[PDB]
Amino acid sequence: STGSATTTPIDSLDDAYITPVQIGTPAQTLNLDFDTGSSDLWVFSSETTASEVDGQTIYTPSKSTTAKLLSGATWSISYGDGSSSSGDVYTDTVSVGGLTVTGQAVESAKKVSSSFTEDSTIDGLLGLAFSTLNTVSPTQQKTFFDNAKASLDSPVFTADLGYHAPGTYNFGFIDTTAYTGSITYTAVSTKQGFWEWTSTGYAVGSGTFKSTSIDGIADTGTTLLYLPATVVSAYWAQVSGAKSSSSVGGYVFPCSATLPSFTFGVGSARIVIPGDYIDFGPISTGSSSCFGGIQSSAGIGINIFGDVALKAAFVVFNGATTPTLGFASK
């Protein structure tokens, strides 16, 4: 089996990407945030506190003939940005881009935090990290990828995120037309439940490459690129007027600037993030101060190769017995 689905930025900044998902019988289509940094598939639903729903499409289990309540199961999750959600659990049929899993745990939200309510374009999350992070209790549940794996032509999925443009998530095959040159594979540690790997270094603009190991996670559910303070300081030092602002919460820069590119290492290979990808626009409507797309990971406790990095590449999430990550330019 294979699947292929288009993923679309939710706004002009690429703050996140939504991908249509069919749930239940007849299908209910919800637009989910595919998240390689978490392992719960949860949805706005008919059970969600009414006051906490503002424009999202909801899943209504009672209208699905294949929905079954998973008796006694509950879930509760908190994300790195402080958002949270929780509820109960159904099993149902879930299809992504033609690929169908029967008996998928669909986690139904009874409660969601304000950030989710406030984002009318995201109907839920579909987690694609390792199933060990799944929060369902008392019986932990598998991810959509985990459930699909055995049926797939190849035990892989790929992320091809667009810059201010649609992209693609594929399951079960590698589209050799979707990237240039070759794919460079690198080792993964599953020890923290993430697609965790080690970049071989970085460069700023046309500067010389600095060889140095940067341990981080490939996380499609995080907007920005979070790296050690040393690295981030070296990048923003090349932008006149850029500074770290505690009041804004990160590096800002004059909106009149031309940003340099940022290169990161995958083994011997290099992925170049164009400078434009690092511009996230005025800090507030009408401001001439713009928010940077590369920020310090200090105080996160982990480095995050978020969408800013990943959208510069074709990324293979290889779920073989020994998982690996592959990166290609595109």
From Swiss-Prot:
Residues covered by the Peptidase A1 domain: 17-328
EC number: 3.4.23.22
Entry annotated with the keyword tRNA-binding: no
Leading EC class: hydrolase
Gene Ontology MF annotations: aspartic-type endopeptidase activity
UniProt keyword terms in alphabetical order: Aspartyl protease, Disulfide bond, Hydrolase, Protease, Signal, Zymogen
Residues the record marks as active site: D35, S199
Residue pairs linked by disulfide bridges in the UniProt entry: C255-C290
Catalytic activity: Hydrolysis of proteins with specificity similar to that of pepsin A, prefers hydrophobic residues at P1 and P1', but does not cleave 14-Ala-|-Leu-15 in the B chain of insulin or Z-Glu-Tyr. Clots milk
BP GO terms, sorted: proteolysis
Family: Belongs to the peptidase A1 family.
Protein name: Endothiapepsin
